[PDB]
């Protein structure tokens, strides 16, 4: 009955934990004990982008590393040129409560979603020249937290109804549904090959999902509270998580366990966004105390601070060639750092 | 070609400057508690109310996207203690700590609230009404610091004069905010 199955689950959990403990040969800190420290990282604001009325919830760079999209809760989507501070597109939304945005790898599409439980796909390259809603995907039960285009016809969404989904924009129907979480899914990160992805949720756990087979492969449980952001290491064999316990953590897919923890004694606010630099040596992390921090990911000590915002930092991102870092904030200003 | 890029940018900003005027002239109201957006207008001023009944029972993640509304409208009809607990957790939230609450006691005792036997304001119904109002007001007037207040009302009718009340407390909220900013209150 219930008791026998619960006992079997407890036995399996102990078996998994001891199998993981058998492989903890050494620590990351001892292996990187003889590594020269990064130094001190001083970054400077190059551009400041001002066109939004309300707080900003999301941003996403393009593949050309020059154009970018941003979402604000006044009901607005804006596309900027980062070099010259122009405004290529401004798109008014049907709903004013938007929590996510994304950029297609080809550059012809953008996406958004929020408290309307819908994902809206916008076609930038209209033949007539005007941006119109190309598609409206609606099968989720709770709000949307994140979305990431795989290609021009596939997209992955995460919802506050504790499920993730893979869509088919041509037909607008769910192809695979990923159901293993017991709390809101808050973020997701596609692998460099786009064959797997990871998702962090409010049950204080993260999961690795196989896109083709639609099954969960590994679960990682180190945090203590809800996970807010999740990134993917450049070679796709590790990832990093930031949560409400005011810590970041690094996990390895091959060792199936946590490697490093990035925290300090005077940081008691939750992390809202994380990102990696091009070589994977620097971990950037946005906080609730209105500024971002830079972590030497191989040694777990701070190397710089990005303090330029007057309100909570909501979004943070690094370009593909790795030259600039954009951050958004609840004070309605985006800032680019170099 | 840079001239055309500047021209398109200037068109974008010319539209955004017109959008800013409409956005700043509306008041946005959350309608949690009981009974998705609905715009309306009273005495030539526009209000915009949102009812979020399409979500699930866990609120701690989508509640904070309402940190800049003018007021929250909390409707309440042990079902009184859960309402008191939700009011307490909304009142003390870090992102909703400057938002005022318009409270509508739609219920218009000694076993579940044993302190009713030592409470003095048929007079029994009025005594019960003011006991419940005083419960919510004892929660509200505890950790405000003067940045928000609670406006309790008693409603049981067809809800005719319920929109004049929202108008009159949304006026008071802004008047007190400015008088406090100018160091006059």
């Amino acid at each position, epitope marked *: 009955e219930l008791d026998q199955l619960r006992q079997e689950a407890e036995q399996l959990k102990n078996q998994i934990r001891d199998a993981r403990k058998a492989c903890a040969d050494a620590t990351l800190s001892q292996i990187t004990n003889n590594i020269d420290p990064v130094g001190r990282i001083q970054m400077r604001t190059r551009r400041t982008l001002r066109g939004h009325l309300a707080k900003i919830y999301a941003m996403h760079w393009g593949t050309d590393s020059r154009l970018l999209v941003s979402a604000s809760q006044d009901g607005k989507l804006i596309i900027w040129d980062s070099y010259t501070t122009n405004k290529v597109h401004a798109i008014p939304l049907r709903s004013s409560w938007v929590m996510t945005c994304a950029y297609a790898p080809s550059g012809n599409y953008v996406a958004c979603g929020g408290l309307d439980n819908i994902c809206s796909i916008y076609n930038l390259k209209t033949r007539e020249g005007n941006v119109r809603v190309s598609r409206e995907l609606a099968g989720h039960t709770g709000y949307l937290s994140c979305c990431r285009f795989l290609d021009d016809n596939q997209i992955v969404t995460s919802s506050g109804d504790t499920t993730c989904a893979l869509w088919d924009i041509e037909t607008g129907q769910q192809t695979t549904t990923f159901t293993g979480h017991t709390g809101d899914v808050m973020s997701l990160s596609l692998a460099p090959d786009t064959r797997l992805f990871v998702s962090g949720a409010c049950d204080a*756990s993260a999961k690795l999902w196989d896109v083709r087979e639609g099954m969960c492969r590994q679960t990682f449980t180190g945090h203590e509270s809800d996970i807010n952001a999740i990134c993917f290491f450049p070679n796709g064999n590790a990832f990093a998580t930031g949560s409400d316990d005011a810590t970041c953590r690094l996990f390895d897919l091959r060792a199936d366990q946590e490697l490093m923890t990035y925290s300090h004694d005077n940081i008691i606010c939750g992390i809202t966004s994380v990102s990696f630099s091009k070589s994977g040596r620097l971990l950037l992390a946005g906080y609730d105390d209105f500024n971002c921090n830079v972590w030497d990911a191989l040694k777990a000590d701070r190397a710089g601070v990005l303090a330029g915002h007057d309100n909570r930092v909501s979004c943070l991102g690094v370009t593909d060639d790795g030259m600039a870092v954009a951050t958004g904030s609840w004070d309605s200003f985006l800032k680019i750092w170099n | 070609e840079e001239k055309a890029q500047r021209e398109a940018n200037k068109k974008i900003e010319k539209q955004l400057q017109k959008d800013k005027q409409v956005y700043r002239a509306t008041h946005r109201l959350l309608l949690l508690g009981a009974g998705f957006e609905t715009k309306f207008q009273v005495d030539k001023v526009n209000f915009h109310m949102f009812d979020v009944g399409g979500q699930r029972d866990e609120r701690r993640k989508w509640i904070q996207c309402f940190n800049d509304v003018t007021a929250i409208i909390f409707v309440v009809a*042990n079902r009184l203690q859960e309402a008191l607990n939700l009011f307490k957790s909304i009142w003390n939230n870090r992102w909703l700590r400057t938002i005022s609450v318009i409270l509508f006691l739609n219920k218009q005792i000694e076993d579940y609230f044993p302190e009713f036997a030592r409470y003095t304001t048929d007079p029994r119904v009025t005594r019960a009404k003011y006991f419940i109002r005083d419960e919510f007001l004892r929660i509200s007037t505890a950790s405000g610091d003067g940045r928000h207040y609670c406006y309790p009302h008693f409603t049981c009718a067809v809800d005719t004069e319920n929109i004049r009340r929202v108008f009159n407390d949304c006026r008071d909220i802004i008047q007190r905010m400015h008088l406090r900013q100018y160091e006059l209150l």
Partner: nanobody
Amino acid sequence: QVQLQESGGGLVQPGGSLRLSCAASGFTFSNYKMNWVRQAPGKGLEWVSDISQSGASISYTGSVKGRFTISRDNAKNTLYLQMNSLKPEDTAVYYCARCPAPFTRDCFDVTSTTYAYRGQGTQVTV
């Protein structure tokens, strides 16, 4: 991983006393305030009591006030409930719950149908 295991309970005559215990692991006990929640057979989950990070603030639901006592032991990482002078209305399943985030003063979603940081509960029949 966050774990909360409840112990104590059983069948008792009216007027008797019980002591429920909740052992916690997988997090720092001292940064969180903890609650006792209860579900009666036939109704939904109902809040019962809560206590703060150190034990200064204690709150009870009205019906149980005066005859339930909550306490916590941060050194041994445990939470208690002393329940004397029980009544037949008290037969229910008792769960030990934790606030979502540390250092905060608002406890949200602790009595939902699906919460992630509450135990499996013990049965108390009177």
